[PDB]
Design a protein around this ligand. Structure first.
Ligand SMILES: [Cl-]
Ligand SMILES: [Cl-]
Length: 162
């Protein structure tokens, strides 16, 4: 199990524009296109992202190319963030995947907002951080995925994914 396989399980793969859990226009492997209600605002973004006229549809390769960019961007974002970096640095290899997962899903700014949980992870208080992470909109909106990530933070193993 690695970060790629983990996110691919959590996000799925779709070759045609679809709407995410929040109702936003998405494509491929969790690649957010626009928060705009316009399908046209989405087809536009998509062609801009791919560099071709897609007409809302992409190939597997194109979807994986986006996925690669987004994971890389997620990682560099954590490393550049004053709030996130220390946390990441303090963690083992499995738990690091769990933080990258949240960041990919909710953006750097969102996760950086989990002040208390971040502090508990840094202190290696696994159980307490798992409890606090659960008191969030995130967990209430996408409970199965949140539980998986949370379990990963609690245990340090890939159990939740196998
Ligand atoms: Cl709550
Ligand atoms: Cl879910």
């Amino acid at each position: 199990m690695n970060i790629f396989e983990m996110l691919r399980i959590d996000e799925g793969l779709r070759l045609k524009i679809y709407k995410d859990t929040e109702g936003y226009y998405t494509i491929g492997i969790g690649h957010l296109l626009t928060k705009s209600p316009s399908l046209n605002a989405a087809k536009s973004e998509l062609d801009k992202a791919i560099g071709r006229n897609c007409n809302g549809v992409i190939t597997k390769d194109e979807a994986e190319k986006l996925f690669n960019q987004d994971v890389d961007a997620a990682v560099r974002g954590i490393l550049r963030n004053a709030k996130l970096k220390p946390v990441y640095d303090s963690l083992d290899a499995v738990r690091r995947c769990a933080l990258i997962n949240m960041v990919f899903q909710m953006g750097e700014t969102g996760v950086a907002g989990f002040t208390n949980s971040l502090r508990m992870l840094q202190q290696k208080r696994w159980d307490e951080a798992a409890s606090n992470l659960a008191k969030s909109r995130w967990y209430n909106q996408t409970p199965n995925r949140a539980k998986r990530v949370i379990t990963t933070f609690r245990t340090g193993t890939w159990d939740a994914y196998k």
